[PDB]
């Protein structure tokens, strides 16, 4: 209710809004690379599964 208090509130809000958030692009790239890894491993397993019914890999 005092013009000093509101100015201090504005200053503290400006201080708090400048917090450095963590990097997110690399964080998501981690998940993307893990997805690629899992896909490759599952593809290897599926290919070796196919090599059981017949005696040759695809093509």
């Amino acid at each position: 209710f005092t013009l000093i208090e509101l100015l201090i509130v504005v200053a503290i809000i400006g201080i708090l809004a400048a917090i450095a958030i963590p990097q997110f692009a690399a964080y998501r790239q981690k998940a993307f690379n893990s997805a690629a890894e899992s896909d490759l491993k599952n593809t290897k397993t599926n290919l070796e599964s196919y090599y059981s019914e017949h005696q040759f890999y695809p093509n």
Partner: protein, 92 residues
């Protein structure tokens, strides 16, 4: 050939051979080369990724390269390891 796949797709089928259906993850692209049929060469690269994992039938571990453009491992002609080549050997 080098029939790549993404999402859901089909692999092989030449000379009227049976063709299996490979379903990858959301938006991961997979490059496959079956050669004559004795061996296979696999590769993997996420669309918004920073690595290109790859392997082969004769190998025993997945190899990567931080270029996302290192072509793909062709089918090796007989018990030929791909881990050690110029486009690879950054062992996992």
């Amino acid at each position: 050939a080098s029939k790549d796949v993404t999402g859901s797709g089909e692999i092989g089928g030449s000379n009227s051979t049976p063709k299996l259906a490979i379903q990858t993850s959301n938006q991961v692209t997979l490059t496959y080369d079956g050669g004559t049929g004795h061996t296979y060469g696999i590769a993997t690269l996420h669309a918004k990724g920073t690595r290109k994992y790859a392997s082969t039938s004769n190998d025993t571990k997945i190899y990567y390269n931080d270029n996302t453009a290192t072509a793909a491992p062709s089918a090796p002609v007989g018990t030929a390891t791909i881990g050690g080549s110029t486009n690879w050997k950054n062992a996992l």
